Subunit: 149 residues, 3 copies
């Protein structure tokens, strides 16, 4: 039984030119790319993405940091919502475990490279916000017999 | 004092073509390759390898998954039995620490890439099962003065 | 607010020819190279570097192991003194977390590849011991807007 999570490379990931390295970390576990699109995030869409934080003092600067090119992605795998969170590491890179993306690449929470859904409910909401259903692709990985038990 | 451990790349490591990457992780610590052999594991040898699991319900499916090409290896180093276990990570890749082999490459326990001896006694037994003494090679690493205190 | 830490690649890092790999790990987080110098450490400077172990029985052998080529470095970043220590891992490689330099490269404390300052006071002292002020270079990373919040 597999699930799907929303992962988004933030403008710092694009500008630091580590997009390929990020994708490779998820491919390495046999996670399937179900969707992928480069766009430029805008305030209206970011207000919806960060709807839980409406009105909080840090939101305007957060939206400013996130207004830029992003790579929208959907990855599929066993327990991938929780596992992708573990792979990204703590929101604050200084607290993230060695071997995680944020510990290996970043310094501060406001520039922490990547977003991933924090729950099944958020994954559904975020995939619906950033992708059209046309953009989610169904296919099977040829190495499935050696990835899944 | 160094010791020797038995490490075996399972059929998923062969088929996903990550043999070299696995070997590089152990070489990176200055662990010495003392033996190495590609073979195809068969039910009779796997029954002996997994003798501790005799009679258990999951053993038939385990033998099925393991029937395939494997790379038998012996690595030598300080505390290498316990250290190789640490580097492999938890049996369940989803529970394994970031930076370990199973966390970095895998999703499920039944396809977790690699076996390693879990004790001095099992290392002795496993090395003897898969290798004849004439297959174990003794030489000294040229960088020993910079690896060992 | 950034700080500076003293990091030194020990003779084993030079001789095992992993200098570039070590530097890349710190560059990967957006830490700035503020100083760098290859030298051959002398007992005189090492006795001051290790002044805290004066009178201990292991000090003569520690100085012996360190009398050799070293790469002196200063890196700058947010919380970089503590973060660089986390990236290095525990003094004993066997106790270090996977994904740290010592766990990924080393076996024993006496050959643990790299030194890093352990506190603000020790960083200030160590930078002054190994570098003249004219050797510390001030410049801004072009990617600063995408590294710092
Ligand atoms: N409930 C179980 C028990 C075992 N296994 C499989 O059987 C192997 C051996 O189980 P065990 O010896 O308990 O785990 P490890 O020591 O991690 O395995 P290995 O000896 O292969 O390193 C596991 O690695 C896993 O592939 C499984 O899929 N489900
Ligand atoms: N018990 C010890 C303590 C230190 N050492 C060595 O001496 C160095 C300095 O010791 P330390 O306690 O200040 O540890 P670090 O801060 O260097 O990690 C270590 O990095 C090791 O090379 C050792 O080999 N055994
Ligand atoms: Mg076992
Ligand atoms: Mg110290």
């Amino acid at each position: 039984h597999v699930e799907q999570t929303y992962l988004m490379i933030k403008p710092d990931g694009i500008q630091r030119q580590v997009v390929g390295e990020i994708i490779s970390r998820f491919e390495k576990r046999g996670y399937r790319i179900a969707a992928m699109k480069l766009t430029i995030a805008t305030p209206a869409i970011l207000e919806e993405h960060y709807a839980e934080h409406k009105g909080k003092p840090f939101l305007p600067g957060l939206i400013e940091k996130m207004t830029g090119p992003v790579l929208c992605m959907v990855f599929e795998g066993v327990d991938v919502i929780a596992q992708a969170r573990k792979m990204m590491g703590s929101t604050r890179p200084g607290e993230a475990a060695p071997g995680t993306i944020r510990a290996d690449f970043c310094q501060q929470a406001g520039r922490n490279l990547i977003h991933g859904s924090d729950s099944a409910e958020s994954a559904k909401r975020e995939i619906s916000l950033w992708f059209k259903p046309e953009e989610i692709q169904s296919y099977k990985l040829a190495l499935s017999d050696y990835i899944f038990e």
